[PDB]
Design a protein around this ligand. Structure first.
Ligand code: CLA
Ligand code: CLA
Ligand code: CLA
Ligand code: CLA
Ligand code: CLA
Ligand code: CLA
Ligand code: CLA
Ligand code: CLA
Ligand code: PTY
Ligand code: LMU
Ligand code: PQN
Lengths: 143, 107, 107, 107, 41, 734, 165
């Protein structure tokens, strides 16, 4: 966005008991994802890693082992309460990377700031045959 | 829902253990029969894995009218034990004996 | 179980021809058929049948007999349902025919 | 103990009249295994007139049930509060659907 | 009536009618001509 | 990540999962997809792999020779080629019991042995091997041959000795040399060995290396060859009352055309085989000077392909541009080679049983049955491989700009018509074959079997009458003396060929009834349907209406997801994997027909097959149920006979078939979630979370799922049918 | 006497099969009183079996070594040996009926594709139109070959959807 928010580990977690689909050994060895949002009131939601939790009125922080769980929680909060959350990725060494709102306006919008990458300027079906690209390491769709 | 993973994992473990200690028993019997070792089988003559609990329950229910249901004239069924009831020369109901094969198929 | 239960029995089912039990044997054979016919609904997928249907659509379009309702392959869930239904029907009918023929011929 | 139970008779069309086996009692038909003969013997049914009357009453009750479905959908449809009375449903089912039915069958 | 007629105009109803007609025709042919195998008169 | 096991794939190296092992094994010999490699390196790897495959072949046959010579009864079988069964190899199983050891002691052995069904005993008796020392020296010689083939594989892969890319592309010289040397002079050497050794050994004269160069193969002594008086070789053939082991009733003839079979052993004559291989040798050597080598004469393959374009646009551009298509694409040549070798294997299966080339092979019923079944299954598998590699050619290396308007572009143009017509003929055959079979089964069920539809195979019966079979009647060729075909060569091979074809005991043109015609039409249905699946996969390999860009996704990809209605099993690999099922069913049908017809012929109850193959209940009862009595009684609580191993491997095959079902019905997601739960269980327990996996356990891929299910299915199919076939043919016959 | 097959009238095993079927029918018949419905049903079955065995004879039918009749397949051989009605004429009749069905379906498809929403006409049949086309297909081969002649039977490949190469 205008200024990228920084992850605060001291923000309170939502009211929830024990978890079984939560963090495995990958969290302490590889990266794990952390979703934060700002609940205006006390309400009950459903986590993608198990049953139901209650989010606190204020900042809420949750931890997941997969980015798909973070985006599932993000779209559940956006469709149900229009929450606009955001999740970071934390590596084993503590590096924090901002993932979902890269320009802060969500990928449904445009913002006229992003650069289109991995785009082919030809129509699909105009790609060359696999015989044309052989023993070269380049796929017909990568050119 | 909050401990479904533990539920499914323990159910998977007990399913694997039951499948091993029943179907592997069957395969063991087939192999040691094909290997010429009738004394190494899990049969009624070689290694008796008799259903002691089922046999005890059968004996208790055969004696259910004797002490615990004194107003019943006979047993509630003839599968526990007793005489053989036949109609028209064909066996209507007779006592059923449970052995090693019965334990194997029940497990 | 193969020899003393499935091969020792089921001789009445295959020898039921020329008698009143023959339909059972007929059903028996048909049941085997249905049990086989499910398998490619259980195996395979949808893209192969969709492309075969596309070729058949080309054939009917050459003769101008292509239907207005576009023929499509069965859905993956639909294909799984058809496969499990035909598989269960074949197995249940096989056991029904074999059981009834064996238990009527010698029972 | 000597005549097999039979309640299905086929039409002689393409040689399927061989399915009308010699069940005994001067009758030809398919040996039924549903046990309806034993149920009718347990119910005191002796002649075919009682079976005819039971069939007519069953057809009348089926027509009444179809009329009830049409009526309770199109004409007089119960509200959501009527269905949600689980206590009344349980009481009426335990007392009249099961208890009164058991008493009527005992009588 | 025309709603009922269009209901009978649906594919399963006309399929049932065709199946009944064809089965009855073949069954009456096989009954009145018992066991036909060889086309002779 | 970046593990060392997939050294041919960087992307597979950085795979932190168990799949890296599996894809590290299945993509082991797909050099075209290996990273950082060229066509020359691929060709050199192909050469080294071919040398290795050859060395493995020679090691396997050397091991067969050694395990027959050691712990075998080859000399006892030579003395008595009827009574004593052959021995394959000894059994040393510490898990065996005393009744198992006593029951497996057969053929006059000192321990448990396996009765050989391969047919090496009959073959080696026919070619002249008699002693165990000859088999020993043959085994060590073939081991040395495998050693020098290993030397060739290592040496031709070494630097400064690797052949150039164009060296493999020398199609004309390779064709000329492999026609002249690999086929021609090899057959000349084989018929020379036949004339020198096998015919004297079949005439009671021992010709070894010690007495070589001192025993004349023919009493005339090579002067008829120079003078052109080649009829002196066909002067004194072996009589009808001739013993194969001795010199009684012998003759002096090395080359002849004595048609039919040897009356004593019911096999083809050795002089006939020698003359056949000599004629094949001279014809192949003559044909091997066709193509243009470095000399000034020959034929150019590209020029022949350019010239054979029909006028008036019948085939469009014709066969133009096809030379570069065949030469550049290894998969085109692979498909052509596998198709031709499968056709040849099917020919071998269809001709060995009717024309037994080895002495005392027709009497060995189990051997002939196993050989036919093995050859037909191998043929079907490699025809499926031929079509699969043709689809691989269509996906990987096919340039429409190169061969534009030619036959390949034309069959790609009207591929819908070909697929639709194949689907039509398959539907027609299956519909009416099942209709007739069900009609006959219902008719036989009603107690009046005369209502069943029995179409006499008049076409094949008329063909067999045109070739000598007078039992069907008629007045065609080779059955009436007034026919020009009968008059031509009436003293050459007809006095033997008609004698062999008019006898009903042998398998040469057996009597065929309506059930034979019905099962042949079912075989035609199987062939047409398998062809339809394979050409639907191959023609729609690079594109379809559902998937236009199927060339960009490679040959073996799982699906495109649930979009566009569902796209599972859309690759040509999945079409091949379905056609493997259909090919297995087809070869099962042909082997069921062969086994039942030959079993009824050997038992003498040919009428049982004639009146029982009409309806499928006869197939289920009189063949599948009647002949399985001795198989399932191999081991029981009563005791054990010699067929206990066949019963065990029969149940083994049924179990592997069941495990194929396990891998085939369920696809991925249940197993992925189950493995996830197992991962949580292992991670969240004491005393076992200390040991951890280096590679993350994952569910097997959908392509891998199809491969594993197909492998278990085929293994169970093969083991079950081999068990039933061998047990039924050996429990009542010897 | 073609294909080594004896005629059913002069055959031997055909008579054995006939006597066996009559014998088991009489064995089933003897278990019932003559004035009973199962007796009448078994007598009708025996009469039908005798009539079928008589009608299979005196019709050129051939059977080989089992008494079960065989059908001569090749036309010409069937034409010159009085076996045309075994398979040569039944396939002609089947081709007539199959072409009737195909021509009626083709006419219905073509006439139903003209109006708006043809899928509704496909899934809700126009019964008067279907019955009119049902009774107008008695001359299907003449009409089919005439549409072949004028080219309306076939569609040009430029107007037919074609899968990508
Ligand atoms: C024995 C089991 C069996 C049977 C009968 C079939 C039958 C068929 N398969 Mg399948 N197949 C099977 C197993 C089976 N498959 C398995 C296990 C696999 C491996 C996965 C495959 C793989 C496979 C492929 C890859 C392909 C086929 C194709 C076909 C068709 C072949 C055309 C033919 O022979 O005429 C049809 C013959 C039949 C016997 C079909 C059954 C119809 C009978 C007569 C009943 C008809 C209805 C009847 C009147 C009853 C009506 C009432 C009832 C519906 C309730 C046909 C629909 C091909 C196809 O689509 O053809 C164009 C094709 O591409 N199959
Ligand atoms: C008869 C066929 C068959 C067999 C044997 C199996 C076997 C298996 N499936 Mg499967 N299944 C099948 C068909 C079959 N499947 C089909 C067709 C479907 C489709 C509907 C499924 C659907 C299905 C589901 C949905 C599930 C299974 C599961 C299982 C497991 C059963 C649990 C157990 O105790 O296994 C024990 C193993 C066996 C019984 C295999 C035989 C073992 C023998 C005795 C060998 C013993 C060890 C041996 C000596 C070692 C060999 C040494 C060698 C390497 C040298 C096992 C891996 C379950 C699972 O994953 O585990 C719970 C599960 O959830 N299957
Ligand atoms: C495998 C289990 C099993 C089964 C099926 C039976 C069945 C039977 N036994 Mg046996 N029994 C068993 C195990 C079993 N027993 C073990 C013992 C050793 C302790 C005994 C000791 C025993 C004796 C000493 C006697 C029997 C007798 C009987 C008969 C009647 C029993 C009866 O009235 O039950 C009750 C019948 C019901 C229909 C009640 C069913 C209620 C349903 C299922 C709902 C239950 C919900 C429950 C109340 C909620 C849980 C509450 C919990 C949280 C506190 C019957 C044939 C008697 C006999 O001889 O037969 C005449 C008799 O005298 N049994
Ligand atoms: C004691 C009174 C009584 C009785 C006997 C029944 C009986 C029945 N109810 Mg009902 N029910 C009752 C009161 C009663 N209900 C009340 C008070 C409520 C509201 C709280 C409901 C709400 C209810 C629902 C929501 C449903 C039922 C259903 C059923 C049927 C269950 C299927 C069965 O067992 O087959 C037994 C079948 C027979 C014995 C065949 C004869 C059935 C006869 C015709 C019914 C006679 C009983 C009837 C209640 C008499 C009053 C009707 C009168 C106005 C004509 C059964 C007919 C189910 C249903 O719709 O089934 C159709 C269902 O889904 N019940
Ligand atoms: C002349 C013979 C020949 C040659 C040279 C090739 C060469 C090739 N084929 Mg072809 N193929 C052949 C025959 C041949 N194939 C036959 C006969 C079939 C039919 C079965 C196929 C079917 C086929 C398919 C479908 C595919 C190939 C592919 C390939 C490539 C990968 C091979 C590799 O390095 O991976 C090495 C591969 C393996 C190690 C896998 C082997 C696993 C086998 C099935 C296990 C053995 C079964 C069983 C478990 C054994 C134990 C039995 C048990 C009782 C103990 C390579 C270009 C692939 C390709 O080009 O990629 C796009 C591909 O997709 N081929
Ligand atoms: C005349 C010289 C000559 C000879 C003898 C060979 C011989 C051979 N070369 Mg060739 N080659 C030559 C010149 C020659 N080459 C030249 C000049 C070039 C360069 C232009 C090449 C380029 C070349 C390549 C690129 C390759 C070979 C390969 C091979 C081998 C083929 C496989 C094999 O063993 O056949 C086995 C097959 C037969 C002997 C006959 C085929 C089988 C048919 C169906 C007849 C069956 C006969 C009979 C019915 C069955 C008998 C057995 C049964 C009774 C058990 C073989 C060793 C391949 C290789 O490395 O080894 C695999 C290979 O990839 N060659
Ligand atoms: C393509 C399939 C086919 C096959 C394999 C046969 C096979 C046969 N036909 Mg036939 N035929 C066929 C189709 C076929 N027919 C068709 C479509 C017609 C046109 C109706 C004929 C018309 C015909 C006549 C007119 C005659 C044969 C005869 C014959 C036999 C000898 C043919 C010959 O050259 O000598 C042989 C059994 C001849 C015969 O009866 O053999 C003695 C004979 O006279 N055929
Ligand atoms: C009457 C409409 C009609 C017509 C003219 C055709 C014509 C054709 N089809 Mg098609 N087909 C149809 C309906 C039709 N089909 C239907 C409804 C189905 C779905 C079951 C198919 C499925 C189908 C397949 C899978 C294949 C063909 C093929 C063929 C060709 C071979 C000829 C043949 O008999 O195939 C045999 C056709 C069948 C076995 C389908 C019969 C389906 C029912 C029984 C007939 C429907 C009649 C219809 C209800 C009449 C409507 C009349 C109206 C007044 C209500 C030919 C171009 C084959 C091909 O491509 O050859 C080049 C091929 O592989 N068709
Ligand atoms: C074109 C087909 C020409 C067939 C000519 C048949 C001439 C002989 C003939 O009419 O005698 C039989 C009388 O069958 C009949 O019932 C008359 C069939 C009339 C055939 C021509 C229409 C027919 O032949 P068949 O009944 O003895 O043939 C065996 C059954 N297929
Ligand atoms: C055994 C013989 C098998 C023969 C199979 C058919 C071979 C010929 C294929 O060609 C098939 O399509 C062509 C292209 O639409 C038609 O070609 C032409 O047909 C008519 C003239 O004859 C014209 O009305 C069409 O407009 C024209 O296209 C052929 O008339 C038809 O038969
Ligand atoms: C065969 C097959 C198909 C192709 C089959 C299709 C599209 C369904 C065909 C249904 C037919 C039309 C039913 C009616 C058949 C007869 C025309 C009706 C009986 C006719 C007689 C009474 C005359 C799939 O689409 C598929 C999809 C997903 C998994 C597996 C499969 C699969 O195995």
């Amino acid at each position: 966005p205008w200024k990228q928010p920084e992850l605060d580990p001291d923000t309170p977690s939502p009211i929830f008991g024990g978890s079984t689909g939560g963090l495995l050994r990958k969290a302490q060895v590889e990266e794990f994802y952390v979703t934060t949002w700002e609940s205006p009131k006390e309400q009950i939601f459903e986590m993608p890693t198990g049953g139901a939790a209650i989010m606190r009125k204020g900042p809420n922080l949750l931890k997941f082992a997969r980015k798909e769980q973070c985006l599932a929680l993000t779209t559940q909060l956006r469709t149900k309460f229009k929450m606009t959350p955001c999740f970071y990725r934390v590596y084993a060494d503590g590096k924090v990377e901002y993932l979902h709102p890269k320009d802060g306006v969500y990928p449904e919008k445009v913002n006229a700031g992003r650069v289109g990458v991995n785009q082919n300027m030809r129509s699909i079906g105009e790609n060359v045959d696999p015989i044309k690209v052989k023993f070269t390491g380049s796929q017909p769709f990568t050119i | 829902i909050r401990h479904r993973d533990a539920i499914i994992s323990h159910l998977n473990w007990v399913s694997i253990f039951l499948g091993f200690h029943s179907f592997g028993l069957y395969i063991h019997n087939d192999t040691m029969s094909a290997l010429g070792r009738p004394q190494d089988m899990f049969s009624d003559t070689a290694i008796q894995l008799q259903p002691v609990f089922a046999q005890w329950i059968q004996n208790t229910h055969f004696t259910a009218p004797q002490l615990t249901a004194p107003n019943a004239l006979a047993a509630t069924s003839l599968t526990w034990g007793g005489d053989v009831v036949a109609v028209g020369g064909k066996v209507a109901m007779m006592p059923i004996a449970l052995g090693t094969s019965d334990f194997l198929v029940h497990h | 179980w193969l020899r003393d239960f499935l091969w020792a029995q089921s001789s009445q089912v295959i020898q039921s021809y020329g008698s009143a039990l023959s339909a059972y044997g007929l059903m028996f054979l048909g049941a085997h058929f249905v049990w086989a016919f499910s398998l490619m609904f259980l195996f395979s997928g949808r893209g192969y049948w969709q492309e075969l249907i596309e070729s058949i659509v080309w054939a009917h379009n050459k003769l101008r007999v292509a239907p207005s309702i576009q023929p499509r392959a069965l859905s993956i869930t639909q294909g799984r349902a058809v496969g499990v239904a035909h598989y269960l029907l074949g197995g249940i009918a096989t056991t029904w025919s074999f059981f009834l023929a064996r238990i009527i011929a010698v029972g | 103990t000597h005549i097999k139970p039979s309640a299905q008779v086929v039409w002689p069309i393409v040689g399927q009249e061989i399915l009308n086996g010699d069940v005994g009692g001067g009758f030809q038909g398919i040996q039924i295994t549903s046990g309806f003969f034993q149920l009718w013997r347990a119910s005191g049914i002796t002649s075919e007139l009682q079976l005819y009357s039971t069939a007519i009453g069953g057809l009348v009750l089926a027509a009444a049930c179809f009329f009830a479905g049409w009526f309770h959908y199109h004409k007089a449809a119960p509200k959501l509060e009527w269905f949600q009375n689980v206590e009344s449903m349980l009481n009426h089912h335990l007392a009249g659907l099961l208890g009164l039915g058991s008493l009527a069958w005992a009588g | 009536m025309k709603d009922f007629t269009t209901y009978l105009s649906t594919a399963p109803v006309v399929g049932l009618g065709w199946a009944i007609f064809t089965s009855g025709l073949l069954i009456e042919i096989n009954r009145f001509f018992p066991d036909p195998l060889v086309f002779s008169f | 990540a970046t593990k060392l096991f997939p050294k041919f794939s960087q992307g597979l190296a950085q795979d932190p999962s168990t799949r890296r092992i599996w894809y590290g094994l299945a993509t082991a010999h797909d050099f075209e997809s290996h990273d950082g490699m060229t066509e020359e390196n691929l060709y050199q790897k192909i050469f080294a792999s071919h040398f290795g495959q050859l060395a493995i072949i020679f090691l396997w046959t050397s091991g067969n020779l050694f395990h027959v010579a050691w712990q075998g009864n080859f000399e006892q079988w030579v003395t008595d080629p009827i009574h004593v069964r052959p021995i394959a190899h000894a059994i040393w199983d510490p898990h065996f019991g005393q009744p198992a050891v006593e029951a497996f002691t057969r053929g006059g052995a000192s321990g448990p042995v396996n009765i050989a069904t391969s047919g090496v005993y009959q073959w080696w008796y026919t070619i002249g091997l008699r002693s165990n020392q000859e088999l020993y020296v043959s085994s060590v010689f073939l081991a040395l041959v495998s050693a020098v083939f290993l030397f060739a594989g290592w040496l031709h892969l070494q630097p400064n000795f690797q052949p150039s890319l164009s060296w493999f592309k020398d199609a004309e010289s390779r064709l000329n040399h492999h026609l002249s040397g690999l086929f021609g002079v090899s057959s000349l050497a084989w018929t020379g060995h036949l004339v020198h050794v096998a015919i004297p050994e079949s005439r009671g004269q021992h010709v070894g290396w010690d007495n070589f160069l001192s025993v004349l193969p023919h009493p005339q002594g090579l002067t008829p060859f120079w003078s052109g008086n080649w009829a002196a070789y066909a002067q004194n053939p072996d009589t009808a009352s001739h013993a194969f082991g001795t010199a009684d009733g012998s003759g002096t003839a090395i080359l002849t055309f004595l048609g039919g079979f040897h009356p004593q052993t019911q096999s083809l004559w050795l002089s006939d085989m020698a003359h056949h291989h000599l004629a094949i040798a001279v014809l192949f050597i003559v044909a091997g000077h066709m193509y243009r080598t470095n000399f000034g004469i020959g034929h150019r393959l590209e020029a022949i392909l350019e010239a054979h374009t029909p006028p008036a646009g019948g085939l469009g551009a014709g066969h133009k541009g096809l030379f570069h298509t065949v030469n550049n694409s290894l998969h085109f040549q692979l498909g052509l080679a596998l198709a031709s070798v499968g056709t040849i294997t099917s020919l071998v299966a269809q001709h060995m049983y009717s024309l037994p080339p080895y002495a005392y092979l027709a009497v060995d019923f189990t051997t002939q049955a196993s050989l036919y079944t093995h050859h037909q299954y191998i043929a079907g598998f490699i025809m499926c491989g031929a079509f699969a590699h043709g689809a691989i050619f269509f996906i990987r290396d096919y340039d429409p700009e190169q061969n534009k308007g030619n036959v390949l572009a034309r069959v790609l143009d009207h591929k819908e018509a070909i697929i639709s017509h194949l689907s039509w003929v398959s539907l027609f055959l299956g519909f009416h074959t099942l209709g007739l079979y069900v009609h006959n089964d219902v008719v036989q069920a009603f107690g009046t079997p005369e209502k069943q539809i029995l179409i006499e195979p008049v076409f094949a019966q008329w063909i067999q009458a045109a070739q000598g079979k007078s039992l069907y009647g008629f007045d065609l060729l080779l059955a009436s003396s007034s026919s020009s075909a009968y008059s031509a060569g009436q003293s050459l091979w007809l006095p033997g060929w008609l004698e062999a074809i008019n006898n009903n005991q042998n398998s040469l043109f057996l009597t065929i009834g309506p059930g034979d015609f019905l099962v042949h039409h079912a075989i035609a249905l199987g062939l047409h349907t398998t062809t339809l699946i394979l050409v639907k996969g191959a023609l729609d390999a690079r594109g379809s209406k559902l998937m236009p860009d199927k060339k960009d996704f490679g040959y073996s990809f799982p699906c495109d997801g649930p979009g566009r209605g569902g796209t599972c099993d859309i690759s040509a690999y999945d079409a091949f994997y379905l056609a493997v099922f259909w090919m297995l069913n087809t070869i099962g049908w042909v082997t069921f027909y062969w086994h039942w017809k030959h079993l009824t012929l050997w038992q003498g109850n040919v009428s049982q097959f004639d009146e029982s193959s009409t309806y499928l209940m006869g197939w289920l009862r009189d063949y599948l149920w009647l002949n399985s009595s001795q198989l399932i009684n191999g081991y029981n609580p009563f005791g054990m006979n010699s067929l206990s191993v066949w019963a065990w491997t029969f149940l083994f095959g049924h179990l592997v078939y069941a495990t194929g079902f396990m891998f085939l019905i369920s696809w991925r997601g249940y197993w992925q979630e189950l493995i996830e739960t197992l991962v949580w269980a292992h991670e969240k327990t004491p005393l076992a979370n200390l040991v951890y996996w280096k590679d993350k356990p994952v569910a097997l891929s959908i392509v891998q799922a199809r491969l594993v299910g197909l492998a278990h299915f085929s293994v169970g199919y093969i083991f079950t049918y081999a068990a039933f076939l061998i047990a039924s043919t050996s429990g009542r016959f010897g | 006497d073609v294909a080594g097959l004896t005629p059913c009238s002069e055959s031997k095993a055909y008579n054995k099969l006939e006597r066996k079927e009559l014998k088991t029918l009489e064995k089933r018949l003897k278990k019932y009183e003559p004035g009973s419905a199962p007796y009448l049903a078994l007598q009708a079955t025996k009469e039908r079996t005798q009539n079928r065995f008589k009608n299979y004879a005196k019709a050129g039918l051939l059977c080989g070594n089992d008494g079960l009749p065989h059908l001569i397949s090749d036309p010409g051989l069937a034409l010159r040996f009085n076996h045309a009605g075994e398979v040569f004429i039944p396939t002609f009749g089947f081709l007539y009926v199959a072409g009737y069905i195909g021509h009626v379906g083709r006419q219905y498809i073509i006439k139903s594709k003209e109006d708006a929403k043809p899928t509704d006409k496909e899934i809700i049949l126009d019964v008067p139109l279907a019955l009119q086309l049902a009774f107008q297909g008695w001359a299907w081969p003449l009409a089919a070959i005439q549409e072949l002649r004028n080219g309306s039977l076939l569609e040009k490949d430029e107007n037919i959807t074609v899968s990508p190469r």
